[PDB]
Scaffold this motif. Sequence first.
Motif, PDB file in Angstrom:
ATOM      1  N   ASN B   1       0.816  -1.218   0.000  1.00 28.22           N
ATOM      2  CA  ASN B   1       0.000   0.000   0.000  1.00 28.22           C
ATOM      3  C   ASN B   1       0.866   1.293   0.000  1.00 28.22           C
ATOM      4  O   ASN B   1       0.428   2.331  -0.492  1.00 28.22           O
ATOM      5  N   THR B 233       6.140   1.614   8.210  1.00 30.17           N
ATOM      6  CA  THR B 233       5.884   0.242   7.780  1.00 30.17           C
ATOM      7  C   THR B 233       7.137  -0.320   7.136  1.00 30.17           C
ATOM      8  O   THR B 233       7.840   0.385   6.404  1.00 30.17           O
ATOM      9  N   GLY B 235       9.098  -3.823   5.167  1.00 27.15           N
ATOM     10  CA  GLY B 235       8.959  -5.069   4.449  1.00 27.15           C
ATOM     11  C   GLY B 235      10.211  -5.904   4.678  1.00 27.15           C
ATOM     12  O   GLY B 235      11.200  -5.423   5.246  1.00 27.15           O
ATOM     13  N   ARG B 262       5.491  -6.855  14.910  1.00 27.06           N
ATOM     14  CA  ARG B 262       4.747  -7.599  13.891  1.00 27.06           C
ATOM     15  C   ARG B 262       3.239  -7.617  14.114  1.00 27.06           C
ATOM     16  O   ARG B 262       2.732  -6.921  14.985  1.00 27.06           O
ATOM     17  N   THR B 263       2.026  -6.637  10.985  1.00 22.40           N
ATOM     18  CA  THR B 263       2.817  -6.319   9.798  1.00 22.40           C
ATOM     19  C   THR B 263       3.888  -5.469  10.414  1.00 22.40           C
ATOM     20  O   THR B 263       3.595  -4.780  11.380  1.00 22.40           O
ATOM     21  N   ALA B 264       5.123  -5.568   9.932  1.00 20.89           N
ATOM     22  CA  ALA B 264       6.206  -4.934  10.674  1.00 20.89           C
ATOM     23  C   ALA B 264       5.990  -3.428  10.716  1.00 20.89           C
ATOM     24  O   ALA B 264       6.046  -2.778   9.669  1.00 20.89           O
ATOM     25  N   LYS B 265       5.711  -2.868  11.903  1.00 21.23           N
ATOM     26  CA  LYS B 265       5.414  -1.442  12.037  1.00 21.23           C
ATOM     27  C   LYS B 265       6.075  -0.878  13.287  1.00 21.23           C
ATOM     28  O   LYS B 265       6.325  -1.598  14.259  1.00 21.23           O
TER      29      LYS B 265
END
Lengths: 620, 620
Positions: B1, B233, B235, B262, B263-265
């Motif tokens: 995104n 964010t 990846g 952890r 989505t890794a933020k």
Amino acid sequence: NGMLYPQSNDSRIVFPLDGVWDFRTAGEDSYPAEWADAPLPEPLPMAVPGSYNDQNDELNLRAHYGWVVYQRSFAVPSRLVAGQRMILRFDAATHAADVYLNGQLLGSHFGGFLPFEFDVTSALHAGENLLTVAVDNRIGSSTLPVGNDAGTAFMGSDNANVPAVAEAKKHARRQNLPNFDFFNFAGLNRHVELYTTPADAYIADIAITTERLDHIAGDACTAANALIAYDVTFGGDGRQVRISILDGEGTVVAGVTADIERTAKASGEIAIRDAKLWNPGAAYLYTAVAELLPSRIIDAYRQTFGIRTVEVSGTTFLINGKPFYFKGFGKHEDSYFHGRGTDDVLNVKDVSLIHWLHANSFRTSHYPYAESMYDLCDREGIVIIDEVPAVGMSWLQYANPLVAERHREAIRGMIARDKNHPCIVMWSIANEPGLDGDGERPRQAYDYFRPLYELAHASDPQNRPVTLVCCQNDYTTDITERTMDVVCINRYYGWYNLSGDLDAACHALNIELDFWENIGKPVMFTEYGADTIEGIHGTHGEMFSEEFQRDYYARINAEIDKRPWFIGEQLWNFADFATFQGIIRVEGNRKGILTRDRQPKMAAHWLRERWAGIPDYGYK
Amino acid sequence: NGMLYPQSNDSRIVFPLDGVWDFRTAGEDSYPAEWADAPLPEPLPMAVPGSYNDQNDELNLRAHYGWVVYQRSFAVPSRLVAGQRMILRFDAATHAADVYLNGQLLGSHFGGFLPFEFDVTSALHAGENLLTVAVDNRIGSSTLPVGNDAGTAFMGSDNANVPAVAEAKKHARRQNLPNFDFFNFAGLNRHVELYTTPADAYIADIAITTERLDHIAGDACTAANALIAYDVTFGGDGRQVRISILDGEGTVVAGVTADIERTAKASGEIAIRDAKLWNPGAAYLYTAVAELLPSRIIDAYRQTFGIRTVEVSGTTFLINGKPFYFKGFGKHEDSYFHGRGTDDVLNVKDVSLIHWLHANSFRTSHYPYAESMYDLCDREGIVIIDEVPAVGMSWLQYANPLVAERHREAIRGMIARDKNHPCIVMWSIANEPGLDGDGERPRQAYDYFRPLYELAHASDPQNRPVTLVCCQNDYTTDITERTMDVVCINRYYGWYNLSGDLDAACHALNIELDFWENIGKPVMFTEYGADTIEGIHGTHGEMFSEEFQRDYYARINAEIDKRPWFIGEQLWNFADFATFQGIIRVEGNRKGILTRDRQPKMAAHWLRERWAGIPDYGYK
Ligand SMILES: O=C(O)[C@H]1CNC[C@@H](O)[C@@H]1O
Ligand SMILES: O=C(O)[C@H]1CNC[C@@H](O)[C@@H]1O
């Protein structure tokens, strides 16, 4: 001396520095040197490449005199720079520039239309780097192109005998006064980029030449055999370079390994069987790939070229042995917001318009153009006359050694940059310098230009013809133009003289054509035309109407068609363009057959129909 | 995104792919897929970025319907792809594209005004790579922007009842018929670039928000304390990221080390004392530097931002708690040769003209603009209303699930790309969709648009106001516009109705303003204007004269000045622009206050004087 355009491949990477930079105007004769040490204070935005003059409507940058300062930051990964030779290249900074990197002065350049570069390997550091470029727009009696130190710009109006005028001139704001008919657009007009090469040994220059063609086909599309020569120069420090010749489809059709001998050079020849020749209207390009050898490759560069010969013979101009006829115009690098800034969308569009018109050629009036335009004309089969910025010259310049040195610099720099282009068939060493007159003036002009004619010949490994574009003058006292390889004349019979009277204009032209008939050289127009405002119409077209412009070309072209030794028609101009303001320039020069937005006037349609019926070869 | 604009730093490099590409036109409904396996045959040149339509006058590319195919080659050092994640980014391919690299289909994309990217780590190889991009220009009842499947373009003429016309339509050449009033310029309109990130762990997205301001200064230049929030964010694959806040001079004024989870933020808040606020006419930018930690740095990204709050309160629009008044216009990305192609020289010039005019804002009518323009407006203190390409919609589209999904994609994609810009103060989810009428139509429109209003609010971490730009309509049966956070109306009283009669136009306007007075929302014009041919003059100016355009704004503006709840005047248009040809478009749309070449008509001078006297804050 080599200025190969930066390339990315397995051995080399280019890091473009175009975009929106910071910018400040500075003084008439100075700028703050401390601006290179820290970010510019209160900066304006300024896109690069582009002229700066039309990029800010709050300021009147068209009126600016003196210096401006550009600045930006950049960062690149340590992995990119490690072990490499780092070069910072300015494709063009108009007219003169001082370049700083992290506060260190790299050097300076004069000459606003040719590229220059610096080795920045030791000045770069990790993280953000600060690049500051001061650019000077000033022109005058010792610059090329020439400015006037006082009085008016070219074809300006004056009332110099009025005392109030003489007095106000003494206190008027300083402004550049072009002695040439185009606006003095300045700034970072062309791209800026950082590039890498290997450090220990690298390819520094390549020249490819077409030495000989054997058994050229009747249509000139091929030759049984073509002998080409290569000349590679290396920098750095029993070494070898592999040279591969790739055809239009990427197929390696020939290959040789050459020894590098010491100033490191590799040189030789290659025979190409059934070679596909480059012709106007039918381009064909090969690639010479030079690979510096140690398995591995140390360095590599891919140089495009086209196989073709150019020879003046008697009153003919032979391309691949065929009698060529030029159809075209002088151009300008000029467009609304960009000014003289390079714009490849517009270059692509212009080359398509050249095809739409059925023209086959143009001249780079009055300065070398951006490198990408020559690559485009290479692939599109459009012939170029390549011209240095020696416009506005007269006897005051010929007596000035600084001007002669700047003139030699421009000629060497243009030919070193552009020698590999098949589309270039002829060099122009000046536009409309003073050549005629009495006493010793004609001989003084001759003694100034003859060495430069010899210089252009000595510099070009292809040995193409060399011309000088001649202003309308007393052709009987000019002794210089008639010694050029092709006689290139600008004539405005019926516009600037015999105004509006096309019968008298044609009579005058025929009188001068009788003169050139006896000289025995091939002759072409490089300029002729009439200012024309689109939408001005008349049943009997007068000066500035679309009909007059059409009638002008119809009448004049009928006369040169009767002369077998007249080998081309390049008109003025492709498109309307900007000039210094004055009483004879309606929003600039309006002699374009296209408007500034590239729309066709009545004359363009007429010329399109004429040129559709004239072959590139054998018309005369 | 996340679609962070590609950045070069010690961990990351960007490799631009702009330049002169190869190009061929293809079929109405197909292209040869084998063109991706080898160099295009007999290619034309095509500059990138740029629309293709005005880059070839030999062909009639404005008339083209269907596919074209772009191609180029490129090569990068193996030393710099080694170990890295390799991403190929298209800033915009208009409208749909299939992308191949070395014969392999990477994937496809539909929105024509927002960026998309592919991971090509595995498709790249050493030496020359061959990039082939098929671009589809077709529009219709399922696209955004909307085309018409039959009949005429927007505001086209017809004689549908003539049998010969009905029969000729059945066999006429297929042509895109915009249901929107701008030309359907297509192609690689924005930049193409390959870029690298670290492969094991990398920064994928950054969102900065202004959460709260304490004790704002009377002049809004500072606040005693500002609370900002970050959301980073990652990846890839006890990890940490350092966040440094740099002020305008590069001084680190605040900084935090946050845990990655952890989505890794990573997310948190940062207090900034004596914060310098971003305002219209007085920009101030900070930089959020995010550094992924393992002394070394694994990855880094520098995100510009500005500290300001936006809040609608009653009938006021508050920036940093001060009542803002919009002065400005709708724009277009439109210019002579580039078409819809991005041009940073033109962006820089246009922002200077916004300042010259004393305007403070514009809307991105009718599609998101190039990312560089928002960066420019951030730095130059110009407020933006950011708009998706949902133009030309009516009830036919509201029941089409493909359209609804494309509409949601555009809203999410615009806000994901643009959320960090301080200059953006409001989102527009459509321009002039059908909203009124009888029966179920008003409710059908409301049920379509209300989930999209909520989607825009849920997508934006700053929770900025959301509007929909309303066409001139029966405001009494429209039930959707009045539910927006700001009422944005397009009205052409005295032009498309009551034509020429400014007394009646003002009376009609005042009747409608009385309606909006009772609704109790803040209201602004997003469009109003009159086509004007520069050079057409009259002592009592009639439609198309410069004087009528001036009188039009003079009369209309006097009426809205009497309404305290009317918070902004954005006129139509900043500058004349290209449209599909038709009987009401004289070389395009001529409602510009500037000409297409950015020159000021009479009304631009009048507006400049009006706007000079209107403050950004506290006019009402
Ligand atoms: O006067 C003209 O129109 C032309 C005369 N010859 C030189 C050109 O630069 C100039 O523009
Ligand atoms: O009709 C007009 O001039 C305008 C009406 N509103 C929508 C605009 O795109 C259009 O250009």
